[PDB]
């Protein structure tokens, strides 16, 4: 039968639904865009930028090799890029 | 007589909101140059 919620087909054809959502949907899309274009996503998550996988004259992976010093090891690699 | 905010409402926006955020981030990504 039905459990009482408003039917989807009735909502997404409603004028009020689209009044709210023609703002929220692009706003979210733009927010996501900006997270990347600003470079914030790189910094939050620790992802290398195309220029920062290797130091210039280097082809060794900065591979983590210690369990409890692993935090310091990664920072040591990032410093070999500044 | 329909309520607007339900459990259903929450399940939906719990998926829908970050999905569109992520879509924007991924679309931006197509323009990144090396």
């Amino acid at each position: 039968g039905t459990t009482g919620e408003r039917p989807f087909s009735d909502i997404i054809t409603s004028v009020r639904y689209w009044v709210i959502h023609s703002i929220t949907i692009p706003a979210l899309f733009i927010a996501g865009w900006l997270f990347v274009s600003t470079g914030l996503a790189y910094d939050v998550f620790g992802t290398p930028r195309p220029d920062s996988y290797y130091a210039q004259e280097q082809r060794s992976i900065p591979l983590v090799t210690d369990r409890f010093e692993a935090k310091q090891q990664v920072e040591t690699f990032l410093e070999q890029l500044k | 007589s329909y309520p607007i905010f339900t459990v259903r409402w929450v399940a939906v926006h719990t998926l829908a909101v970050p999905t569109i955020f992520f879509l924007g981030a991924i679309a931006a990504m197509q323009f990144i140059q090396r």
């Binding site: 706003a27 733009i30 927010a31 900006l34 600003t38 | 607007i4």
Partner: peptide, 28 residues
């Protein structure tokens, strides 16, 4: 830093605009 409001602002205004458009019907 600064980039975090830039990212958050569309969301926050999206949340305001929905709040103001729905507030009466949520009261009922």
């Amino acid at each position: 830093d600064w980039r975090v409001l830039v990212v958050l602002l569309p969301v926050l205004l999206a949340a305001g605009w929905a709040v103001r458009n729905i507030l009466p019907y949520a009261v009922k």
